[PDB]
Symmetry: D2
Subunit: 252 residues, 4 copies
C-alpha cells in the first residue's frame, strides 16, 4: 500500500520508512531538510525505494502523496521537537507552545487531513510515534513530557471513533531508541561511545541496551500490515524495560 513517514531522517523515521519499504509498500517521506531541492534529490538518489516529498505542511503533504500515489493507506506520524530541560519557572510560555505545536498539533493535523479518505473506504492505519517519558517523567522536562502524553491520549481517543470505520490507531512511545546520526534523541555519539552514557543505558533499561531502528521498524510494519488490528487504541512502550527503579542499599 501507500504510507507516509514524517521527519524520516530523525527519530523512528528510517526504521519505519525502510521496513515498510522492504515490505513492498510505497513509502512517501517527509523531512524539514526536503525543503531544499538539493536535499530531496540526494535522498531520492540514495533511497530509490522511498519517495521523498517536498511538502512541509500537514494537509499539503497528504494531498501531494494522494495525487502522486493514489491514496494514503498508512500514516506514521514520527513527531519530534528539541526541548531544553529546565525548571518550570525558567521556561518561557512559548517553550510549551512550541512543544505542543510540534508534538500534539502536528499529529492531530495529519490525522485531521487524512481521516476523510480512510473513513470513506473504511480502511487505513494510523500510527503516532510519541514518547515513553510520560510513563516515567524526568524532572525538569515538563513541556516535552506533557505534550507527548497529550499525543498518546489523542491516539487512544481516536481509536474509539475510527474503529467503526475499521481504522486501527496506535501510539508507539519509545525511549533510549538508538537514533544513529540523528540528534533525536540517542545518537551513536555519545550513547554508544561514551562509557558514562553506556553505563547509564545499562542501568535504566531492563535489557541493558538501546533500542534499535529495526525493532521500531518491525513493530510499525506489523501494525500497518493489518495482522493485528484488534490491538487498536494501544500505546506501546518501546523502552526496553525502562524505567528500572533504584533498589535499596545493599542490593546489587
Amino acid at each position: 500500500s501507500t504510507a507516509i513517514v514524517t521527519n524520516v531522517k530523525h527519530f523512528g523515521g528510517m526504521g519505519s520508512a525502510l521496513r515498510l519499504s522492504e515490505a513492498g509498500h510505497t513509502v512517501a517521506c517527509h523531512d524539514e531538510s526536503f525543503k531544499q531541492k538539493d536535499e530531496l534529490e540526494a535522498f531520492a538518489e540514495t533511497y530509490p525505494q522511498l519517495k521523498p516529498m517536498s511538502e512541509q505542511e500537514p494537509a499539503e503533504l497528504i494531498e501531494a502523496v494522494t495525487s502522486a500515489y493514489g491514496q494514503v493507506d498508512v500514516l506514521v506520524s514520527n513527531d519530534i521537537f528539541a526541548p531544553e530541560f529546565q525548571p518550570i519557572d525558567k521556561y518561557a510560555v512559548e517553550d510549551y507552545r512550541g512543544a505542543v505545536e510540534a508534538l500534539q498539533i502536528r499529529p492531530f493535523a495529519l490525522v485531521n487531513a487524512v481521516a476523510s479518505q480512510m473513513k470513506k473506504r473504511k480502511s487505513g492505519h494510523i500510527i503516532f510515534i510519541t514518547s515513553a517519558t510520560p510513563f516515567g517523567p524526568w524532572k525538569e522536562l515538563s513541556t516535552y513530557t506533557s505534550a507527548r502524553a497529550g499525543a498518546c491520549t489523542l491516539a487512544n481517543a481516536l481509536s474509539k471513533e475510527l474503529g467503526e470505520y475499521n481504522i486501527p490507531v496506535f501510539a508507539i512511545g519509545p525511549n533510549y531508541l538508538h537514533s544513529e546520526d540523528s540528534p533525536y534523541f540517542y545518537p551513536t555519539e555519545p550513547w554508544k561511545t561514551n562509557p558514562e552514557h553506556v553505563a547509564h543505558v545499562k542501568k535504566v533499561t531492563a535489557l541493558q541496551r538501546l533500542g534499535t531502528q529495526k525493532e521500531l521498524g518491525e513493530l510499525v510494519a506489523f501494525l500497518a500490515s493489518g495482522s493485528c488490528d484488534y490491538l487498536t487504541g494501544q500505546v506501546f512502550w518501546l523502552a526496553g524495560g525502562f524505567p528500572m527503579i533504584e533498589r535499596w542499599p545493599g542490593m546489587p
Copy 2:
C-alpha cells in the same frame, strides 16, 4: 494563607473557593466576567468571604494577588473550555489549538508565574482541576480529552521537580460533577431534571449520581491543608466510579 481559584464561577470553581475559605484561606478569585467592574462587585457582595480579582492574565494575576495579600500559598487552576463533540475530520486544527491553549498552556502559565515565589520560600500547593475523560474517552471528543491528558501529565511531571522545594502538585480529574448554574459541564438542568440525562447518570457512574461541589471542595481543601503532601503527583479520578462498563446480555 492565600489561595487563588480561577474561573471561580464555573466547573470546580465555587466548590473549591467556598471550602478553601471555610478552612481559613484568604481566597482570591479569578473569572472572565470579572473584567467588568459590575460583575466583580456583584460577586464580592454575594460572597463577602471571597476576594474577586479583575486581573485576567497569569502573570498579572499572581502579581496582583501577591501585592494585595502578600503571597500565593495555594494555586487551584480550575481550567475550562467549551468543546463540541466532532469526528476528527469535522474539527478544525484551530479547535485543538484552542483546547490546548485553554487546558494546557493556561495552567502551565500560572505555575510558570508562581513557581518562583513558592520555591524561594520552599512552601506551597498546586492543584489542577482537569478531567476524568482521559480515563475513559467517549467517541468524538479527541481534542478536549487529549488536552486534559496533557494537563494531568503536566501535574505529575511538575511534582517531580517541585518536590525538592516541598511543593506538592496534584490533578483532580472530575466527570459528572454537578456544576449547578454553570454550563461547565453538568448544570442542574437538564442533568438533574430531564428523565434521559438523569437515567444516563445512574447508568454510567458506580454511585449512580452526580458529584457535588462540596465533595470536590473537600478534596481541594484537604490537599491544600498540608495533611497529605505525600500524595504529590497523584491524579485523582473524581467521577463516582465512572466509567461503568456494559455487561453481557441478560445481566440486570
Copy 3:
C-alpha cells in the same frame, strides 16, 4: 526453536499454537484433556504439525518438553479459569483462592520452572495470556478480574529481572476474543449467532466485532520471533477498542 502452549484447546491456545507452528517453531502443547491417551492421540492426528504432551504439572511439563525437544525457547502461559459473576458477598473465599491458583500461581510456577534454563543460555521469550478485564472491570467479577491483574503485573515485574538475561516478558490481555468451540470465553454460539450477544459486541468494542484467533496468534508469533524484544514488560490490550463508553443522551 521450541515453544510450549498451555490449555491449547481453549482461550488463546489454538491461535497461538497454530501461528507459532507456521513460523517454524516446534510446538509442544499442553491441555487438561491430554491426561487421557485417547484425547492426546486424537489431537496429534488432527494437528500433525503440533506436539501434544500428556504432562500436567509445570515442573514435569518443562522437563518433558526439554527431554523430547532439547529446550524451551518460548513459553506461552495460556491460563484459564471458569468464574461466575457474583456480588462479593455471594462468593466463597474459596472461589478467589481458585481464581488466583489458576490465573497467578500457575503461570508463576511455569516461569519458576523454566527460567533457570533460559537464564543459563541467556535467551527465551515468556508470554502470559491474561485478560483485558482489569482495564475496564464489570460489576460482580472481582475474583477473576483482580487475579488477571495480578498476572499482568507479574509479567511486567518479571521483565525487570529477566531483561538482564536477554529474556523479554509480555502479557496479552484479551477480551471478546472469539474462542470458536471453546467455552473460554467467547464461543461462536451465542456470540456470533444470538441477536442480543452480537449486538452487545458491536456496542462495546470500537471495531464492533470479536477478536480472531488469527490476530492473537499473529501477536504471539511476532513477540516470540525476536523482532521487537524492546517491548519487554508490555501489557497488550487485545480487545478491539473495548471498552466503549456510554455517551450522552441524543448522541447516535
Copy 4:
C-alpha cells in the same frame, strides 16, 4: 462510627487507628500479637482509645466487632507480608502462595464477610492499604509486587458493584512510609539513622523524605469521613513522588 484496622502494630496501622480514634470513631484493632492475652492487655492499657480484639480470622474478627460494638462502618485492611527478594527461579511456589494469601485473599475475605451488613444499610467505607510497588516494580520482588497489584485491582473492581449500595472502596498504596518500630516496612533503623538509606530515600522520592504515619492517617480519616465518596475506585499512590527516574549523565 465503628472501624476495624488490621495488623495495627505494623505498616499503616497506628496511623490509621489513632487518627480514626482522634476523630471520635470506635476503633477495633487486630494484630497477630493480640493472640496472647498478655499482649492484648498491654495494648488495651496503653491505648484506652482503641479496642484491641483477640480474633485472628477474617469472618471471626468481623463478628466479634459487630457483636461488641453494634456494627462495622469502616474497614481498613492493613495487609502485610514478609517477602524475600529473589530471582524468579529461586522462589518456591509456596512463596508466591504465601504472598497472595496474605495480600489478596486476606482483604478479599474481610470484605467478603462485611459486605452483607454494609449493603443492607446502604452505608459503609472500604479501604485497602496495599503498596505502590506495582506502580514501579523493583527487580526480584515478583511475588509481593504482583500480589499487591491484585489487591489494588480488587479494590477498584469492588467500587463498581458497591457504589450502587453507596459504599465507596479505595486502595492506598504507600512506599517509603516511615513505620517507626515496625519492620513493615521502613523502620527508624536504618531508614532514618543510616546515611546510606537516608541518601536513598532522598534520591528516589520527589519530596526527598519518608512518608509519615500522620499523613496516612489523615487520608484514611478523610476517606472514611464520607467527605469525598465520589473518589470511589481510586488507588492512591502514597509514595511522595516515587519513583524518581535516573536522568542522563551531566544532569544534577
